[PDB]
Structures are given as structure tokens and as C-alpha cells.
Amino acid sequence: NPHTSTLALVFYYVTGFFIAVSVITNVVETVPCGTVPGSKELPCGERYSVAFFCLDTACVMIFTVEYLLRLFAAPSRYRFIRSVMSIIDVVAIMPYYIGLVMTNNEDVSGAFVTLRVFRVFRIFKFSRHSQGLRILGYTLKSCASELGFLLFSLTMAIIIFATVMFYAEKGSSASKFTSIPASFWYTIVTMTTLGYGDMVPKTIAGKIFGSICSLSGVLVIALPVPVIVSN
């Protein structure tokens, strides 16, 4: 309870801000800005490498300082570990350490982006601040079953409709429907009413089933949404 005293309030407030700092800078690390007239235009991330570097370090530091002393006052410092927010904090602050251990000295392309990614999970730490996140967590703890059925039903649909699609729009001049696992993209595009217009049937038998697919999708997704919002 931040409202317990005033220093609790200030601690809550102050940790509720470097999360925003770190997420914003994880965004900015990508925006290409600053002409760099000598060469191509650099992403601000590696251009001012030390700046975002030291800011990221400061944020990691603050988060560790918080998390540790939070861990200390825990009565059940074990259950405090199996707590959800503990997992959030640890998996948010770890990729920076493993990044330092696996710095560009020890680097490969297809395995460091997967640790560039997990920096975002720090944003969940707003859970402690706005109820809505927590309350969504709760209502998903509750509504967990219907979602399973949604998932399985969706799987059934996607399969059947992608199959009848492929078999239908196989034989054609420029069939982009070349494989069943390619007709999953199309079928989940349709059944969610998106329609990128990228893969669109072009025979007679393709259009019918694309249409029907659209309706069936409107249906299948409609099942859990009432119980979700009601809960």
C-alpha cells in the first residue's frame, strides 16, 4: 500500500516512472533520426550508443534495487518467488545481464534478437499501478476454460477451410495457394474479417468458401467475448 506512508508513495511513484523511461527508450532505439551526412542514416539506438546504453543501465539498476528489497520484506520469500510479479521482474531484468555476458563480442544474428525482444515485458510492471491490468489478469484466470474451446474450435475451422480452399484454388495459373500451411494465413485473415487482399480466391469454388469462412469466423470468435466482458 503506497498510501501507508509518504515514502511508500514516493517509492511507488518513482519506480512507476523508470518503467516508462525504459520502454520509451527501447522504442526510440529503433527510430532512424539524425541525418548522419557522412554515411547512411543511423538508427538513434547505435548512433548515440552510450546514451541509450547508460539510460538502460540506470533503469535496470533501479528495478533491481526495488525488486531485491521487495523480496527481503516478504514473509514467504518462497511463495513470493512463485508470485507472478516476481517472474515478471526477473525475466525483465535478466536479458540485460545475459546481454552483457553475450555482448556483441559473442554474437550471432538469429539468437540475440530473441533477447532484444524480452525488454518489453517490463511494461507489465504497470500491473502494480493501475487495477485494470490486474483485473484483466483475474478475469482471465477465471475465464480460462472457454478460451481453450475458442482455441480448439478456431483450430478446427482454420484447418477445414484452409483445406477446402487449397484443394479448390490449387489448379490455377498463379496460384498463391501452394500449400496448406500457406492457406492458413489466408483463412485466419478471412475468419477475422481482415482481408489484406493479398491472397484472394479467383476461381468460382474459392469465393464461396472464402465467404462462408468469413461468416463462420464471425461466429467462432463470438462465443467467448460475452462471457469475457461479463466476467
Partner: peptide
């Protein structure tokens, strides 16, 4: 009430000049 809010701001500025120091230490 507000004195709590007052204590809030005075902390963040410290965290700023620290990173502003290493900005010079580049």
C-alpha cells in the same frame, strides 16, 4: 497531500543529472 507530491519530483531530477554526467563522460 501536496507535500507528498512535492517529494516526488525532487527525486527524478537527481536520476537525470547522473546520466547527464556520463553524457559528458562519453
Amino acid at each position: 497531500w501536496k507535500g507528498i507530491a512535492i517529494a516526488l519530483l525532487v527525486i527524478l531530477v537527481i536520476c537525470s543529472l547522473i546520466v547527464t554526467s556520463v553524457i559528458l563522460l562519453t
